[PDB]
Swiss-Prot record:
<dbReference type="GO" id="GO:0036114">
    <property type="term" value="P:medium-chain fatty-acyl-CoA catabolic process"/>
</dbReference>
<comment type="subunit">
    <text>Monomer.</text>
</comment>
<keyword id="KW-0460">Magnesium</keyword>
<protein>
    <recommendedName>
        <fullName>Peroxisomal coenzyme A diphosphatase NUDT7</fullName>
        <ecNumber>3.6.1.-</ecNumber>
        <ecNumber>3.6.1.77</ecNumber>
    </recommendedName>
</protein>
<dbReference type="GO" id="GO:0015938">
    <property type="term" value="P:coenzyme A catabolic process"/>
</dbReference>
<dbReference type="GO" id="GO:1902859">
    <property type="term" value="P:propionyl-CoA catabolic process"/>
</dbReference>
<keyword id="KW-0378">Hydrolase</keyword>
<dbReference type="GO" id="GO:2001294">
    <property type="term" value="P:malonyl-CoA catabolic process"/>
</dbReference>
<keyword id="KW-0694">RNA-binding</keyword>
<dbReference type="GO" id="GO:1901289">
    <property type="term" value="P:succinyl-CoA catabolic process"/>
</dbReference>
<feature type="site" description="Important for coenzyme A binding">
    <location>
        <position position="53"/>
    </location>
</feature>
<dbReference type="GO" id="GO:0050873">
    <property type="term" value="P:brown fat cell differentiation"/>
</dbReference>
<dbReference type="GO" id="GO:0009132">
    <property type="term" value="P:nucleoside diphosphate metabolic process"/>
</dbReference>
<keyword id="KW-0576">Peroxisome</keyword>
<dbReference type="GO" id="GO:0010945">
    <property type="term" value="F:coenzyme A diphosphatase activity"/>
</dbReference>
<comment type="similarity">
    <text>Belongs to the Nudix hydrolase family. PCD1 subfamily.</text>
</comment>
<comment type="function">
    <text>Fatty acyl-coenzyme A (CoA) diphosphatase that hydrolyzes fatty acyl-CoA to yield acyl-4'-phosphopantetheine and adenosine 3',5'-bisphosphate. Cleaves CoA, CoA esters and oxidized CoA with similar efficiencies. Preferentially hydrolyzes medium-chain acyl-CoAs and bile acid-CoAs. Has no activity toward NDP-sugars, CDP-alcohols, (deoxy)nucleoside 5'-triphosphates, nucleoside 5'-di or monophosphates, diadenosine polyphosphates, NAD, NADH, NADP, NADPH or thymidine-5'-monophospho-p-nitrophenyl ester.</text>
</comment>
Length: 186
């Protein structure tokens, strides 16, 4: 099936806990895969304008590890719940992708999660200004704008709203698209 095939692909790139003990400032993100109309989508947030770090920016759900978290995956799930109302029974964490090194002292660990079909996002306005889906296939043929570095523009056909996706977030979206969609029969 589509979902079984995505999970089997993703598992081949799972690094697991290999990098998880290293003495970094630790953040985790959840790459939430949602199946709609027979195709996979990624769920993104727009961060609230009010926040200290990264205001107004398009990010996957996530944030800084805290002492309650059992592990790095727990961080990602906690932050997803606070930001968009995603409960742990509504997500299957499939794998841990390559971590991202930032600022010499920070390690960001991405986890890919399969999202239950009955999940309905409840944006928390203290954390997130918007939540939106992009079809995974988009990241194979994105609409690129050079601001000099590359920015993706995605226009939702439901309402014509354009979103700008860039940086680590854009890079991770492309990675997941390649993993799941490369070399597939039609
Ligand atoms: C957009 C995003 O995922 N994050 C991670 C967790 C919450 C705020 C920081 C933000 C971020 C990650 C990576 C970079 O690299 C330049 C910048 C912001």
């Amino acid at each position: 099936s589509m979902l079984d095939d995505a999970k089997a692909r993703l598992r081949k790139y799972d690094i697991g806990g290999k990098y998880s003990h290293l003495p970094y400032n630790k953040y985790s993100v959840l790459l939430p895969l949602v199946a709609k109309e027979g195709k996979l989508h990624l769920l993104f947030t727009v961060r609230s304008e009010k926040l200290r770090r990264a205001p107004g920016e398009v990010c996957f759900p996530g944030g800084k590890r805290d002492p309650t978290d059992m592990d790095d995956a727990a961080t990602a799930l906690r932050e997803a719940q606070e930001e968009v109302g995603l409960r742990p029974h509504q997500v299957e964490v499939v794998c841990c992708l390559v971590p991202c090194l930032i600022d010499t002292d920070t390690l960001i660990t991405p986890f890919v999660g399969l999202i239950d079909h009955n999940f309905q996002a409840q944006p928390n306005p203290a954390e997130v200004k918007d939540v939106f889906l992009v079809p995974l296939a988009y990241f194979l043929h994105p609409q690129v704008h050079d601001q000099i570095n590359h920015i993706f523009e995605y226009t939702n056909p439901e309402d014509g709203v354009t979103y700008q996706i860039k940086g680590m977030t854009a890079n991770l979206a492309v990675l997941v698209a390649f993993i799941i969609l490369e070399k597939k029969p039609t």
